[PDB]
Amino acid sequence: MTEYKLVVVGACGVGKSALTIQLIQNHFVDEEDSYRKQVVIDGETSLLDILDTAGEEYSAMRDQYMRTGEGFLLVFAINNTKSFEDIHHYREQIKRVKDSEDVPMVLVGNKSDLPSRTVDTKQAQDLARSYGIPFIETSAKTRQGVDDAFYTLVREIRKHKE
Numbered sequence: 280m281t282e283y284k285l286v287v288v289g290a291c292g293v294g295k296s297a298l299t300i301q302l303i304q305n306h307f308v309d310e311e312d313s314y315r316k317q318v319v320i321d322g323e324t325s326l327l328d329i330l331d332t333a334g335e336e337y338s339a340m341r342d343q344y345m346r347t348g349e350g351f352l353l354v355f356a357i358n359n360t361k362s363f364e365d366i367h368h369y370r371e372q373i374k375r376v377k378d379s380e381d382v383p384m385v386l387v388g389n390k391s392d393l394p395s396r397t398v399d400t401k402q403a404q405d406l407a408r409s410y411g412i413p414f415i416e417t418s419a420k421t422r423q424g425v426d427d428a429f430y431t432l433v434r435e436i437r438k439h440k441e
């Protein structure tokens with residue numbers, strides 16, 4: 280059974296936990312930072328071991344997951360300009376800890392269901408293009424893009440491993 284260690288990074292409140300809950304537990308409440316579940320992606324049974332982190336008290340565990348993380352979701356919220364601005368910092372942090380320019384990553388613009396938008400889709404597409412990674416628009420509330428975000432990351436890890 281293939282195992283993938285995934286890390287979901289981004290500013291506080293962008294919906295990292297909400298995205299992961301929706302993926303793993305299939306629900307959303309508008310009111311756990313680690314998850315572990317087996318799913319089937321493209322017919323391959325895959326154990327996902329996931330950490331959600333903004334960069335929290337358990338720094339040692341964070342450093343471990345950053346070092347061993349095989350793929351990263353870089354999450355911002357479409358109604359949070361600062362969270363979009365923070366993405367570069369998170370990506371640079373990952374590249375440094377992993378000592379590599381070729382780390383599987385997906386850019387995720389969450390809260391796509393909300394009518395308040397301050398980050399344009401073109402801005403995000405442009406940034407992802409510069410990084411050479413996929414961009415996926417998501418909503419943890421409506422499930423838009425959720426499986427696609429995580430499964431695309433798993434596919435980016437596979438591309439990296441072979």
Ligand SMILES: Nc1nc2c(ncn2[C@@H]2O[C@H](COP(=O)(O)OP(=O)(O)O)[C@@H](O)[C@H]2O)c(=O)[nH]1
Nearest residue numbers: 291292293294295296297309310390418419420
């Ligand atoms: N409308 C909407 N609210 C969301 C979405 N994702 C998260 N939230 C809400 O945003 C707030 C912060 O989410 P949370 O998962 O705790 O963010 P985290 O700090 O990145 O883990 C919560 O009130 C969530 O219900 C989304 O896609 N749409």
